[PDB]
Design an enzyme around this catalytic site. Structure first.
Site, mmCIF file in Angstrom:
data_model
loop_
_atom_site.group_PDB
_atom_site.id
_atom_site.type_symbol
_atom_site.label_atom_id
_atom_site.label_comp_id
_atom_site.label_asym_id
_atom_site.label_seq_id
_atom_site.Cartn_x
_atom_site.Cartn_y
_atom_site.Cartn_z
ATOM 1 C CG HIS A 33 -6.473 -32.909 2.547
ATOM 2 N ND1 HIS A 33 -7.037 -32.424 3.698
ATOM 3 C CD2 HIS A 33 -6.396 -31.854 1.703
ATOM 4 C CE1 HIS A 33 -7.375 -31.162 3.528
ATOM 5 N NE2 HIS A 33 -6.991 -30.787 2.324
ATOM 6 C CD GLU A 34 -3.463 -31.903 -0.846
ATOM 7 O OE1 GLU A 34 -4.371 -31.120 -1.225
ATOM 8 O OE2 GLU A 34 -2.766 -31.662 0.167
ATOM 9 C CG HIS A 71 -9.346 -30.682 -2.034
ATOM 10 N ND1 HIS A 71 -10.355 -30.039 -1.365
ATOM 11 C CD2 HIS A 71 -8.221 -30.470 -1.318
ATOM 12 C CE1 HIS A 71 -9.864 -29.460 -0.275
ATOM 13 N NE2 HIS A 71 -8.566 -29.713 -0.218
ATOM 14 C CE1 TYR A 86 -10.629 -25.543 -0.131
ATOM 15 C CE2 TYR A 86 -9.324 -23.576 -0.543
ATOM 16 C CZ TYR A 86 -9.471 -24.804 0.051
ATOM 17 O OH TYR A 86 -8.458 -25.316 0.846
ATOM 18 C CD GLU A 121 -9.033 -27.690 3.218
ATOM 19 O OE1 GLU A 121 -8.392 -28.304 4.082
ATOM 20 O OE2 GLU A 121 -8.766 -27.739 2.030
ATOM 21 C CG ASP A 154 -7.689 -20.442 5.444
ATOM 22 O OD1 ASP A 154 -7.229 -20.978 4.387
ATOM 23 O OD2 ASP A 154 -8.151 -21.101 6.406
ATOM 24 C CG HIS A 180 -6.979 -24.606 5.370
ATOM 25 N ND1 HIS A 180 -6.907 -23.643 4.388
ATOM 26 C CD2 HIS A 180 -6.718 -25.790 4.764
ATOM 27 C CE1 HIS A 180 -6.631 -24.227 3.227
ATOM 28 N NE2 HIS A 180 -6.480 -25.523 3.436
HETATM 29 N N1 LIG Z 1 -5.481 -29.061 -0.182
HETATM 30 C C1 LIG Z 1 -5.250 -27.658 -0.359
HETATM 31 C C2 LIG Z 1 -6.485 -26.898 -0.829
HETATM 32 C C3 LIG Z 1 -6.138 -25.639 -1.547
HETATM 33 O O1 LIG Z 1 -5.598 -25.753 -2.663
HETATM 34 O O2 LIG Z 1 -6.421 -24.533 -1.020
HETATM 35 C C4 LIG Z 1 -4.899 -27.275 1.003
HETATM 36 O O3 LIG Z 1 -5.751 -27.663 1.769
HETATM 37 O O4 LIG Z 1 -3.881 -26.653 1.328
HETATM 38 N N1 LIG Z 2 -2.588 -31.672 4.369
HETATM 39 C C1 LIG Z 2 -3.115 -30.767 3.360
HETATM 40 C C2 LIG Z 2 -4.054 -29.743 3.983
HETATM 41 C C3 LIG Z 2 -3.668 -28.310 3.759
HETATM 42 O O1 LIG Z 2 -3.043 -27.902 2.770
HETATM 43 O O2 LIG Z 2 -3.999 -27.509 4.617
HETATM 44 C C4 LIG Z 2 -2.022 -30.061 2.685
HETATM 45 O O3 LIG Z 2 -0.902 -29.924 3.225
HETATM 46 O O4 LIG Z 2 -2.406 -29.519 1.648
HETATM 47 NA NA NA Z 3 -5.912 -28.124 -2.873
HETATM 48 NA NA NA Z 4 -12.408 -29.432 -4.056
HETATM 49 ZN ZN LIG Z 5 -7.459 -29.063 1.368
#
Ligand SMILES: N[C@@H](CC(=O)O)C(=O)O
Ligand SMILES: N[C@@H](CC(=O)O)C(=O)O
Ligand code: NA
Ligand code: NA
Ligand SMILES: [Zn+2]
Ligand SMILES: [Ca+2]
Ligand SMILES: [Ca+2]
Ligand SMILES: [Ca+2]
Ligand SMILES: [Ca+2]
Ligand code: NA
Ligand code: NA
Length: 316
Positions: free
Chosen positions: A142-143, A146, A157, A166, A226, A231
């Site tokens: 997932h990361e 991004h 975002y 997301e 958010d 999310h």
């Molecule tokens: N992967 C991160 C994205 C962020 O940095 O907001 C997260 O979904 O929590």
């Molecule tokens: N699984 C990712 C998604 C999120 O942040 O919401 C994380 O923990 O960043």
């Molecule tokens: Na992120």
């Molecule tokens: Na991104």
């Molecule tokens: Zn994310």
């Protein structure tokens, strides 16, 4: 660092033994020279200064509890690199074999992981809500997805473009989890979420409402929390992707499933050839339809299933 490529061994967050690619120069470093221009894993040492110190180990054995988040961040970055290269012919997140950098032990009790524009960052969790987050291959992928998005579509975002951003990370995080084929599912972060509770996770793609997330556009969140619900409203797109792959009947609309590989091809093409920084959900539908048309033809089942899935979640 300059040094010869070595193979260490250690245990990850969940106690599983695995080999890791390291580099030897006085110490053994978590530097994998076998993929692109390298995969590099760093210790943030419970602080928030990044990246911290390239991970150094005296004996190339990584079995200490303190080692486990680094083992998994390093190993699962490698799996994610392999997925993008082997499945999509993409060399690292920028398509030109950029070095992949990750830091673990970020802050104290930190119940999150993220991509900061330059690198992946993993908290250890507080031991109750999360254990160290690099233990989840879907979280790692997932990361890193991004990073792919930021070098391709560049989805802003916030609001609907942010929810697409997301969902794309949940989709490819899940497809990487299936690619590795250990214990794959359509939930997000189950391996590192709430060690005292079985069966839960942060989000579900198969049933977003399990965790309060919308599964139809009529239920979209329109407030300011958010980043405008990135999310939350991701559930609408996650459900559409789930239906494209697996099929089902949702709010009375039946979708013929076409499987995970075609889901991945359609959304990868949409991400890299059609989406733009400001794309909204209706533009995503159009991008997926045109991507499926490119790959399979306008009269194909694949195009019909994309349309049915977006119909089922109320996205016209
Ligand atoms: N992967 C991160 C994205 C962020 O940095 O907001 C997260 O979904 O929590
Ligand atoms: N699984 C990712 C998604 C999120 O942040 O919401 C994380 O923990 O960043
Ligand atoms: Na992120
Ligand atoms: Na991104
Ligand atoms: Zn994310
Ligand atoms: Ca050691
Ligand atoms: Ca799983
Ligand atoms: Ca999962
Ligand atoms: Ca749990
Ligand atoms: Na929730
Ligand atoms: Na667009």
């Amino acid at each position: 660092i300059t040094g010869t490529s070595t193979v260490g061994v250690g245990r990850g967050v969940l106690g599983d033994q695995k080999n890791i690619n390291t580099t030897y120069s006085t110490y053994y470093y978590l530097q994998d020279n076998t993929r692109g221009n390298g995969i590099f894993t760093y210790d943030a040492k419970y602080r928030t200064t990044l990246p911290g110190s390239l991970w150094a180990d005296a004996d190339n054995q990584f079995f200490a509890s303190y080692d486990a988040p680094a083992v998994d961040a390093h190993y699962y970055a490698g799996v994610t690199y392999d997925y993008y290269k082997n499945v999509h012919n993409r060399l690292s997140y920028d398509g030109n074999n950029a070095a992949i950098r990750s830091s673990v032990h970020y802050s104290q009790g930190y119940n999150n992981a993220f991509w900061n524009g330059s690198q992946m960052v993993y908290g250890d969790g507080d031991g109750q809500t999360f254990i160290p987050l690099s233990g989840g291959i879907d979280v790692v992928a997932h990361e890193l997805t991004h990073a792919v998005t930021d070098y391709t579509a560049g989805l802003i975002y916030q609001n609907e473009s942010g929810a697409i951003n997301e969902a794309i990370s949940d989709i490819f995080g899940t497809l990487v989890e299936f690619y590795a084929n250990k214990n794959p599912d359509w939930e997000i972060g189950e391996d590192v979420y709430t060690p005292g509770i079985s069966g839960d996770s942060l989000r579900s793609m198969s049933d977003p409402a399990k965790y309060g997330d919308p599964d139809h556009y009529s239920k979209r969140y329109t407030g300011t929390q958010d980043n405008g619900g990135v999310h939350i409203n991701s559930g609408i797109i996650n459900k559409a992707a789930y239906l494209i792959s697996q099929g089902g009947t949702h709010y009375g609309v039946s979708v013929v499933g076409i499987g995970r590989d075609k889901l991945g091809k359609i959304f990868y093409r949409a991400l890299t050839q059609y989406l733009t920084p400001t794309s909204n959900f209706s533009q995503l539908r159009a991008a997926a339809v045109q991507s499926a048309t490119d790959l399979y033809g306008s009269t194909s089942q694949e195009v019909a299933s994309v349309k049915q899935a977006f119909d089922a979640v109320g996205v016209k």
